[PDB]
Amino acid sequence: IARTFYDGPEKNYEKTMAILQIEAEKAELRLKELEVRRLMRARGDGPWYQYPTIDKALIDHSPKTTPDN
Amino acid sequence: GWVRPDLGELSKVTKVKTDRPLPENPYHSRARPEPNPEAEGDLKPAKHGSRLFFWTM
Numbered sequence: 393i394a395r396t397f398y399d400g401p402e403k404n405y406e407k408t409m410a411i412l413q414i415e416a417e418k419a420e421l422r423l424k425e426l427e428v429r430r431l432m433r434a435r436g437d438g439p440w441y442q443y444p445t446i447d448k449a450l451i452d453h454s455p456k457t458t459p460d461n
Numbered sequence: 462g463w464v465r466p467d468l469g470e471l472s473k474v475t476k477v478k479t480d481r482p483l484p485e486n487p488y489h490s491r492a493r494p495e496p497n498p499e500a501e502g503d504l505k506p507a508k509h510g511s512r513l514f515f516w517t518m
């Protein structure tokens with residue numbers, strides 16, 4: 393029965409080790425992402441949460457019919 | 462010896478030679494804030510896919 397239907401314990405053991413590593417990495421990545429989102433939303437210095445401002449390319453820098461703009 | 466300017470001459474944009482130095486900051490601007498750093502590097506696939514609750518891709 394053991395020869396025909398199953399494997400040794402080392403296979404399940406090391407598959408479990410691989411599964412555990414994947415899951416623990418995913419967990420720490422999730423926590424880190426939550427912290428990064430908190431900081432990027434509070435500070436606005438990150439690539440995320442960039443709210444539009446006015447394009448400076450719309451300003452007209454030509455003499456404006458009076459000297460003081 | 463005064464000649465009256467012809468039609469269209471007093472409205473020309475002309476050049477002026479001056480000793481007055483070109484003002485550097487006539488708007489009295491402050492220093493501009495520093496930009497955000499930039500995007501850089503090669504794009505690698507996200508580690509362990511999307512990572513949504515139980516999805517492995």
Ligand SMILES: CCCCCCCCCCCCCCCCC[C@@H](O)O[C@H](CO[C@H](O)CCCCCCCCCCCCCCC)COP(=O)(O)OCC[N+](C)(C)C
Pocket residue numbers: 395396397398399
């Ligand atoms: C000697 C006499 C006295 C003792 C009798 C012993 C009793 C044993 C017989 C009972 C059958 C066991 C039930 C089957 C469960 C096993 C299912 C599965 O685990 O088996 C797969 C293997 O497949 C097997 O073939 C199971 C198929 C059994 C299907 C039973 C169907 C019987 C129906 C009877 C119909 C008869 C004719 C009907 C006439 C109308 C394993 O997949 P595999 O990917 O390998 O895993 C890797 C393991 N390796 C490395 C060893 C290869």
